[PDB]
Symmetry: C4
Subunit: 135 residues, 4 copies
Amino acid sequence: SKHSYVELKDKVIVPGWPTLMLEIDFVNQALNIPFLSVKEPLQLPREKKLTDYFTIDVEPAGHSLVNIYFQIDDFLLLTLNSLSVYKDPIRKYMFLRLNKEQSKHAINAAFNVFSYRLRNIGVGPLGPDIRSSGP
Amino acid sequence: SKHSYVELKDKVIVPGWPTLMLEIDFVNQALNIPFLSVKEPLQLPREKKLTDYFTIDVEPAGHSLVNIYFQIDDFLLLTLNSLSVYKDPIRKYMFLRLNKEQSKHAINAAFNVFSYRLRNIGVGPLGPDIRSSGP
Amino acid sequence: SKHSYVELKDKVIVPGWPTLMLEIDFVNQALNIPFLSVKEPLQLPREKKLTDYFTIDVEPAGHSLVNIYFQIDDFLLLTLNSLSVYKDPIRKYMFLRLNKEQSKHAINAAFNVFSYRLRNIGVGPLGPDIRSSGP
Amino acid sequence: SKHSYVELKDKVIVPGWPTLMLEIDFVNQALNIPFLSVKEPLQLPREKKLTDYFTIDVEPAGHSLVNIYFQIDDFLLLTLNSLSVYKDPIRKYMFLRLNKEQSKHAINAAFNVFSYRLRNIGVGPLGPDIRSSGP
Ligand SMILES: Nc1ccn([C@@H]2O[C@H](COP(=O)(O)O)[C@@H](O)[C@H]2O)c(=O)n1
Ligand SMILES: Nc1ccn([C@@H]2O[C@H](COP(=O)(O)O)[C@@H](O)[C@H]2O)c(=O)n1
Ligand SMILES: Nc1ccn([C@@H]2O[C@H](COP(=O)(O)O)[C@@H](O)[C@H]2O)c(=O)n1
Ligand SMILES: Nc1ccn([C@@H]2O[C@H](COP(=O)(O)O)[C@@H](O)[C@H]2O)c(=O)n1
């Protein structure tokens, strides 16, 4: 059956919360993207690798604008939704847009992806106040 | 007779398809641009070079915004339209806009072009699904 | 009590006036931001350091867009408002937006901040005329 | 008397014409900007330098957005208007906006300007056709 690749909008990143970063290596060309804001650091089951539940696709959408496509298996998308700060946003088929700044890196690397991992990034000293004190 | 240089809009790049890249060398300054999405890799006839049917022009259009102009001969523009994913878009007289990120490279190189080639770039692992599964 | 982190909009920078720069060091990754336009260079009291009245927080707000959060104590926010060119803009709880160009630097450094100082930057030769001759 | 610094809009650059470039050196940090499209290369009178009729001012207008201010004397602004492609655009008091890409360079150099010159840049091979064939 047909399935929409749903956009992982910027709202899945909420300031003042810990976030997990999507690190991508290309050929020497890097890419670091705030993937999702979480309320607990992700742990892939003991000896299992990220490659099992998660596969990415870096593809051009214009003359200098690139997208990243995601294939997220049940076990990860259930873990990710439970760790997420914003209401369960992660779908099985997803994509996020790279801005013209980042897109250049992916194009200069001919969209070829060598390796990719998710890493837990901590929060700042004012973090506690940032989240609790909203407009 | 007068002739409009038609804009090669970003829609001629459709994600999940193989694409050919316009590689430009300047002086040491590079430029890599997704030129057109194709459904078969381009082959210039055996021993003939790209210089014969295709000549480019890098020109400024503002204070930090540059354009690239194209002169495409019959043989190439017929081949390109047949390989294209989107409905026959390529005209004899064309131009595409570089964003402020890329424009800087062309300006820093004083618009001088040393060499330029078209290269066939493959598709990702999720590629098959990307094209077939549209919004 | 609840408190809004008020945005330090770009209007607090008025051309033709001396400005103080927020210099941030990350890990080797730098950041230089025009913080506030002043009409007298700031001096932290003799032997006291900036760390006492001023603490920053670098946090992501999207997939490639970062914010900087400020905790400004009474003594500094009173000094800063008095030195400011624009009407007393500085609040106790503040934030300013980094553009996609700068945000990339903060993300590539994993939001980690090593050191940060405020520095007084002089005005140009036409400066006197710039401020006095407004549209 | 009061005088408006008039904006040198991007329209003073018309594609397919030779252009003169404003080259600025800072501290090691560079800046290359298409200044004005001309129909004849500029020549400063024999042994006279550009410093005599032309003085620039690099000033911040926001948190990551910079402007460049111009003081153009009679002799140069008369020469420049006569060489210009677009209708006499150059005024005595002028400014042009740097985009977020370029602004970063000026800020990282603390707005300090070491040297600046105007250089005549040639036109491409399709140049003749570009200008004559307009939309
Ligand atoms: N995501 C990023 C961020 C920065 N960069 C920078 O672009 C440069 C490209 O590599 P070269 O300098 O070897 O050409 C890297 O050295 C790196 O500093 C990158 O390649 N990918
Ligand atoms: N299209 C691109 C993309 C990146 N770059 C980067 O800009 C740098 C400019 O050269 P220098 O470092 O020698 O000044 C290159 O090393 C390269 O990494 C470029 O010149 N053109
Ligand atoms: N705010 C800024 C401005 C420029 N840069 C540049 O990005 C580069 C990143 O470091 P590497 O070249 O060592 O990867 C620095 O060398 C620096 O020239 C930066 O890291 N932060
Ligand atoms: N206008 C420009 C364009 C590029 N750059 C690049 O930014 C770099 C900044 O210098 P460092 O690498 O020495 O930090 C330069 O090497 C240069 O390649 C610049 O400084 N000004």
